[PDB]
Design a protein around this ligand. Structure first.
Ligand SMILES: NC(=O)c1ccc[n+]([C@@H]2O[C@H](COP(=O)([O-])OP(=O)(O)OC[C@H]3O[C@@H](n4cnc5c(N)ncnc54)[C@H](OP(=O)(O)O)[C@@H]3O)[C@@H](O)[C@H]2O)c1
Ligand SMILES: NC(=O)c1ccc[n+]([C@@H]2O[C@H](COP(=O)([O-])OP(=O)(O)OC[C@H]3O[C@@H](n4cnc5c(N)ncnc54)[C@H](OP(=O)(O)O)[C@@H]3O)[C@@H](O)[C@H]2O)c1
Ligand SMILES: [Mg+2]
Ligand SMILES: [Mg+2]
Ligand SMILES: [Mg+2]
Ligand SMILES: [Mg+2]
Lengths: 326, 325
């Protein structure tokens, strides 16, 4: 089920030229981890982008997107999902040669049919299960974010060797690579970020913080209890399991966990998770999201403004600004 | 509202002998952080404890609980909350002298009245807002878990100086010390662990993992998606705010966050939080917990067995054992 360093061949990606289109969250992580893994990488950007100089200063070769796509054997598309079909049609498609590989870090555009690649190129994905800044940070610390590896089209007959070697180059074989399909990855990744990692988690910490401040407790106190301490609890779970986190916390807390958890994450919460999954699988969430992107990110940005001005953020920025380290 | 190093005086706790009763999750953290901060510390344990040799090997003075309470000026009680009244009456109370300080790391027993200390001793609390192993790890890395500082009784007239200095000694001034009362700490601490940090968080990750495995996804994939990635998201929030974590994740994920969050943490979840807080404030949760403790921890241990043998735990133990670093 899970593959590690003995299951992959680093030489396969080391023998191919990689073009990373974009330099955002995933783009910088993939480009720098592959550079450090001995791969010939170049980053493709719009002329005059502010990210040009950043990438150059980090030691990477930077060129325009058309040049990166024409030079590369593996073209990895790391611009926002809603932008990829336009960037693909205008700067990538005409430069694909039979025997190149087009790669993604999410299956959204190929699964939902917004990009249809030509027949004589591989279509692969290396999807790190982790946000880009951390895909970079863990690799520099000797660890690595786990990846899902997928092949939609194998024109060379070695697409699997190529995608597994690319996961190696971004740190995935340190923690584990799982083979999956483009539809599986798209659906589980959408579900996780909606239900648990970003949707669920940020609303649970906001609701706790608002319960405490509504009840009269000071917002600095509520930040250190519901928000800052979260990292500490999750660090123990990440390293050593729920059983070790529950051994570290007091018996008072552990009884409280078992009593309160099903009350806060209730039958309705579970039914909402089933409905989240249903709208992912039926394509309705993907259409909602692309509709909002074609309406100037209207919903996204009014929701961004609301959370960025929430009292948990104003209180947290002041607290964090006063931390001192020895 | 928040106090830092310039607001505390390290020399006060450096001038007092501290006795730590117990050596569990908070106990080892307070003993070793105070040792490293230049305080004269001893740990008090039962003769023959398996923790005795671990504390000696870490370089602490270790004695029996009655000797540590007789040697000390500040006696910090870091045994489980349900057993503090018995250890206090049998090994601590008779050794308190006028001018000593009795300290706790949670206000549960003094708030709910299970311990009533004598009149000429200070009664203080330094409550780190973090699990003990991390109170120690952050201090050794040059950071520190923030603390609540409280004074229930000030016999010496300098109990505030002592508790703030003690918070300095365990790393609290690096991140912030807030003054609070014993009632406020007890209520907010019980609420946070039940509603958010331990109850809410573990059931959220369980429910996402079970949704995916019921829907046919493999458990190892559901572990990496719902459980392992959580640390990574929370790290960004801890270091740089929700606005930075939302800048790091894709626009697809950020739209997904804002659409799905209120559906999973719903109006019922919010009403359950307000009920959790009401049973904390009215003492009913405290009595429920102490009744379970007086029944052999029967409910706690059946629920511990059920989560320790959940597929999320069996899958995680096997995944984590194969990490290369
Ligand atoms: N964020 C994550 O951690 C994460 C996790 C796993 C997978 N994914 C997947 O990785 C992929 C990329 O996501 P991301 O979040 O890394 O992207 P991102 O950070 O939002 O992408 C920013 C990059 O796209 C370029 N860009 C933006 N709009 C553009 C346009 N109209 N034309 C040309 N370039 C444009 C930007 O250019 P400038 O530099 O010039 O401003 C920047 O280099 C997506 O498929 C995503 O689902 C993301
Ligand atoms: N856990 C946390 O992170 C946390 C966070 C903040 C505050 N608090 C508060 O800190 C206090 C201590 O909690 P904790 O979780 O650190 O305790 P703990 O780890 O459960 O305490 C274990 C220590 O208590 C001793 N002990 C156990 N039963 C005993 C008995 N019958 N008689 C004598 N000693 C006994 C143990 O002895 P042996 O070593 O001999 O087995 C061990 O040294 C509580 O007030 C708690 O609310 C805890
Ligand atoms: Mg993801
Ligand atoms: Mg995603
Ligand atoms: Mg606490
Ligand atoms: Mg507690």
């Amino acid at each position: 089920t899970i593959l590690y360093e003995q299951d992959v061949d680093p030489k396969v990606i080391q023998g191919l030229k990689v073009g990373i289109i974009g330099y955002g969250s995933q783009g910088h992580a993939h480009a720098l981890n592959l550079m450090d893994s001995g791969v010939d990488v170049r980053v493709g950007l719009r002329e005059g982008s502010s990210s040009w100089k950043t990438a150059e200063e980090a030691g990477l070769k930077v060129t325009d997107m058309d040049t990166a796509a024409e030079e590369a054997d593996v073209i990895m598309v790391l611009v926002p999902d809603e932008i990829q079909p336009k960037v693909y049609q205008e700067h990538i498609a005409a430069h694909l040669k039979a025997g190149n590989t087009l790669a993604f870090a999410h299956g959204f555009n190929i699964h939902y049919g917004y990009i249809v690649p030509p027949e004589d190129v591989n279509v692969i994905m290396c999807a790190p299960k982790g946000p880009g800044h951390i895909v970079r940070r863990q690799f520099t610390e000797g660890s690595g974010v786990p990846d899902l590896a997928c092949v939609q089209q194998d024109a060379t007959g070695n697409a699997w060797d190529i995608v597994l070697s690319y996961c190696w180059g971004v740190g995935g074989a340190r923690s584990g690579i799982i083979k999956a399909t483009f539809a599986e990855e798209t659906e589980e990744d959408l579900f996780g970020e909606q239900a648990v990692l970003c949707g669920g988690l940020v609303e649970l910490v906001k609701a706790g913080f608002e319960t405490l401040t509504e009840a009269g407790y000071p917002p600095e106190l509520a930040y250190f209890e519901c928000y800052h301490e979260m990292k500490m609890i999750v660090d123990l779970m990440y390293e050593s399991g729920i059983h070790f986190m529950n051994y570290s916390i007091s018996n008072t807390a552990e009884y409280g966990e078992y009593y309160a958890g099903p009350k806060v994450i209730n039958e309705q919460s579970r039914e909402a998770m089933k409905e989240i999954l249903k709208r992912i699988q039926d394509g309705s969430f993907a259409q909602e999201f692309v509709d909002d992107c074609n309406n100037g990110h209207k919903r996204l940005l009014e929701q961004r403004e609301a959370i960025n001005t929430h009292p948990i953020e104003t209180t947290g920025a002041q607290i964090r600004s006063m931390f001192s380290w020895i």
